Amino acid sequence: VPHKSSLPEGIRPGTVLRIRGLVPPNASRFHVNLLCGEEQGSDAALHFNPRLDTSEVVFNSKEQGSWGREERGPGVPFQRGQPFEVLIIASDDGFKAVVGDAQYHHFRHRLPLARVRLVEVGGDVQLDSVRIF
Ligand SMILES: CC(=O)N[C@@H]1[C@@H](O[C@@H]2O[C@H](CO)[C@H](O)[C@H](O)[C@H]2O)[C@H](O)[C@@H](CO)O[C@H]1O
């Protein structure tokens, strides 16, 4: 099961996305997206993309079909066959990514928070819960 849900209340500084899930034993990669529209080709304010196949975690945004400049977090705090907890925290200047007990990365806004409309979680991931606070 992939997660996809609209955000009718929008997201402001202090919005927290909590993702609890599991990386499958033969997983390659999964993703967390904050989209600015409802259909697949919409702009992405955030594309959070742990890649176990290439051993990296890529951050990026997407506008008018074009991926912006990639960012990467320090190491890979995900492991095949192991559960995880990710917090995506919105502030005025960006998104704070929290993995496990550690501040993992800070992704500064490319698109204004007011444009975020949808959260999507999918790929090689099994989900326990996806919550917006
Ligand atoms: C168009 C393309 O293949 N781009 C390459 C990157 O792969 C894409 O990365 C974006 C995020 O930036 C998405 O994760 C998308 O699903 C990927 O296909 C790739 O990460 C980089 C590595 O240097 O090369 C791009 O050319």
Side-chain angles (χ1 to χ4, degrees):
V1 159
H3 179 107
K4 183 183 280 186
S5 61
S6 300
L7 299 170
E9 319 288 316
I11 62 171
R12 314 169 234 172
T15 298
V16 175
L17 173 67
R18 172 206 272 175
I19 305 126
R20 291 173 171 165
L22 177 95
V23 181
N26 307 338
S28 291
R29 52 184 79 174
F30 72 94
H31 61 265
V32 182
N33 296 323
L34 299 175
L35 303 180
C36 301
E38 296 286 355
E39 69 189 314
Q40 259 179 33
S42 306
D43 293 351
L46 174 63
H47 168 73
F48 174 80
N49 187 213
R51 306 175 174 176
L52 293 91
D53 59 332
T54 48
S55 299
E56 55 181 353
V57 179
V58 174
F59 299 71
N60 210 344
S61 54
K62 193 189 52 181
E63 280 188 70
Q64 278 303 273
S66 307
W67 292 106
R69 178 182 208 123
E70 288 189 334
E71 296 177 26
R72 286 162 169 78
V76 189
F78 302 92
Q79 179 175 70
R80 294 177 172 107
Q82 299 296 321
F84 67 87
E85 179 168 11
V86 174
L87 306 177
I88 301 296
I89 309 163
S91 61
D92 270 292
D93 61 353
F95 296 109
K96 299 187 215 172
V98 180
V99 187
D101 294 320
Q103 178 66 259
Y104 179 62
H105 186 66
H106 183 43
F107 188 80
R108 302 188 178 285
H109 299 310
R110 283 100 180 264
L111 291 70
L113 277 181
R115 294 229 182 97
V116 182
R117 178 77 195 192
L118 186 88
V119 40
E120 194 214 351
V121 182
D124 304 332
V125 59
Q126 310 186 280
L127 292 173
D128 164 86
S129 61
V130 177
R131 299 265 65 85
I132 289 96
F133 302 116

